[PDB]
Amino acid sequence: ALSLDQRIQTLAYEELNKAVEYHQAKAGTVVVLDARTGEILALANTPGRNRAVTDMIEPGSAIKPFVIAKALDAGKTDLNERLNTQPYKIGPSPVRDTHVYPSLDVRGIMQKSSNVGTSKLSARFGAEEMYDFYHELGIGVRMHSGFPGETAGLLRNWRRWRPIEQATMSFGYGLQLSLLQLARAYTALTHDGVLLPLSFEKQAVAPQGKRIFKESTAREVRNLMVSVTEPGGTGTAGAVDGFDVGAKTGTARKFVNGRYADNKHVATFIGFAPAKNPRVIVAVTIDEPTAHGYYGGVVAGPPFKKIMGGSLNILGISPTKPLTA
């Protein structure tokens, strides 16, 4: 009794391969989950290996919602604090955003994808604490999917970390996980603070998961993530008619020839809807887009929008606001 929904799988596979063609990308992957049970509704790749489970990627900015959640959960920040987000350096390493934002509140940090803001929240925790937190999200912990070629991913031992590393981990450098592991982590935000195991089998009742955040934290973070798909956000291309969508964009520089490249990227878009009471998670990654943009929002947003809107329809979920399209 497989959890796969054939209509969603077909939609995912078609929209993924079309986006990869349109952006003249090298490859891509899509994961669709039930946001309340962790059932895997669709898993699609471009021709070749099962990259969704086999390929380790850097999460990039798709890790930031968890850093922000953890800071709010532990009371290290709140919705009122405006953080100084001026860029800075440690030795040769910069910690900088796409623009110089003099200050942002936590909403802004999410909305604009501020690396500086995220790093400062992370810096409020000790190294070992952050290491255990990344491990609790499942980073470095094998999925045991049943598929061959699956690895655990990479979480470097905290005793080894240089001063800069905790900072750069907070915007997704140096950690490695599969798209499936990353999609799994988002269940802690959608299932009210409780991380789910994921399953290829239909579930009559949500498995027991593991609490990572307070319900209230997860609820506030989901609302912050709606800012990503609204005007002002990095992810407006992923907005879905009739629904509020909480999402996060990511754009990761590819590490090639012992060097992070200036113009070779992995584009990611992960989101859930309905934002207040989510039922579906869709996670999209596009490797090396070379036409019509390279950022997560512009490249992976449009297929996210079609896969999410279509999935909501297939599952019979009612729009939460009037339609306009």
Side-chain angles (χ1 to χ4, degrees), residues 4-5 23 31 44 48 69 86 88 92 94 98 113 128 130 139 189 191 206 233 265 270 285 297 306 311 321:
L4 185 140
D5 179 289
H23 296 280
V31 173
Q86 293 292 157
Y88 69 92
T98 57
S113 200
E128 192 177 0
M130 283 308 296
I139 301 180
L189 302 169
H191 193 43
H265 292 93
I270 307 200
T285 192
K306 300 214 174 62
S311 292
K321 59 181 182 180

Side-chain angles (χ1 to χ4, degrees), residues 61-114:
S61 302
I63 202 77
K64 299 176 170 179
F66 304 102
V67 176
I68 292 161
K70 177 169 170 54
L72 298 161
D73 208 52
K76 307 294 199 180
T77 188
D78 69 26
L79 302 183
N80 293 279
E81 187 182 356
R82 296 198 54 88
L83 287 76
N84 186 301
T85 43
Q86 293 292 157
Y88 69 92
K89 296 160 54 55
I90 296 157
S93 301
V95 174
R96 55 159 136 164
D97 300 336
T98 57
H99 300 296
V100 178
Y101 300 102
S103 74
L104 300 167
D105 59 13
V106 168
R107 189 169 175 277
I109 291 169
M110 190 77 79
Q111 183 194 223
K112 310 296 185 188
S113 200
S114 179

Side-chain angles (χ1 to χ4, degrees), residues 65 68-69 72 110 189 216-225:
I68 292 161
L72 298 161
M110 190 77 79
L189 302 169
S216 66
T217 301
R219 290 175 192 171
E220 294 296 342
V221 170
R222 294 206 296 278
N223 178 246
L224 296 177
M225 293 176 70

Side-chain angles (χ1 to χ4, degrees), residues 58-252:
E58 289 184 317
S61 302
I63 202 77
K64 299 176 170 179
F66 304 102
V67 176
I68 292 161
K70 177 169 170 54
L72 298 161
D73 208 52
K76 307 294 199 180
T77 188
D78 69 26
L79 302 183
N80 293 279
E81 187 182 356
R82 296 198 54 88
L83 287 76
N84 186 301
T85 43
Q86 293 292 157
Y88 69 92
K89 296 160 54 55
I90 296 157
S93 301
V95 174
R96 55 159 136 164
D97 300 336
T98 57
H99 300 296
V100 178
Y101 300 102
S103 74
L104 300 167
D105 59 13
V106 168
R107 189 169 175 277
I109 291 169
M110 190 77 79
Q111 183 194 223
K112 310 296 185 188
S113 200
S114 179
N115 298 334
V116 177
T118 302
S119 74
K120 288 181 175 198
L121 294 174
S122 168
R124 297 180 187 189
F125 294 95
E128 192 177 0
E129 270 186 295
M130 283 308 296
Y131 168 88
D132 285 350
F133 178 65
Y134 295 129
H135 197 261
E136 277 140 7
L137 294 180
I139 301 180
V141 185
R142 274 191 74 190
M143 291 274 87
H144 287 281
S145 65
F147 290 102
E150 170 193 85
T151 63
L154 189 73
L155 181 63
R156 280 170 39 91
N157 188 306
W158 65 275
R159 292 169 183 276
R160 307 295 287 153
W161 293 5
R162 290 169 148 290
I164 186 59
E165 277 178 76
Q166 182 180 330
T168 57
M169 283 173 180
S170 83
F171 44 106
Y173 282 95
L175 299 172
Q176 298 187 335
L177 77 187
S178 68
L179 189 64
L180 190 56
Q181 287 174 310
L182 181 60
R184 176 182 181 234
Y186 275 76
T187 63
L189 302 169
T190 61
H191 193 43
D192 277 356
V194 182
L195 186 71
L196 291 169
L198 303 202
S199 182
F200 284 91
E201 323 311 326
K202 285 184 182 68
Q203 303 289 303
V205 66
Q208 99 184 135
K210 168 180 71 191
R211 182 164 299 280
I212 309 297
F213 310 114
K214 294 187 297 205
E215 287 193 318
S216 66
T217 301
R219 290 175 192 171
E220 294 296 342
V221 170
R222 294 206 296 278
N223 178 246
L224 296 177
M225 293 176 70
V226 170
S227 82
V228 176
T229 64
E230 284 181 335
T234 59
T236 45
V240 170
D241 192 39
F243 293 94
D244 290 324
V245 173
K248 186 67 194 77
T249 53
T251 308

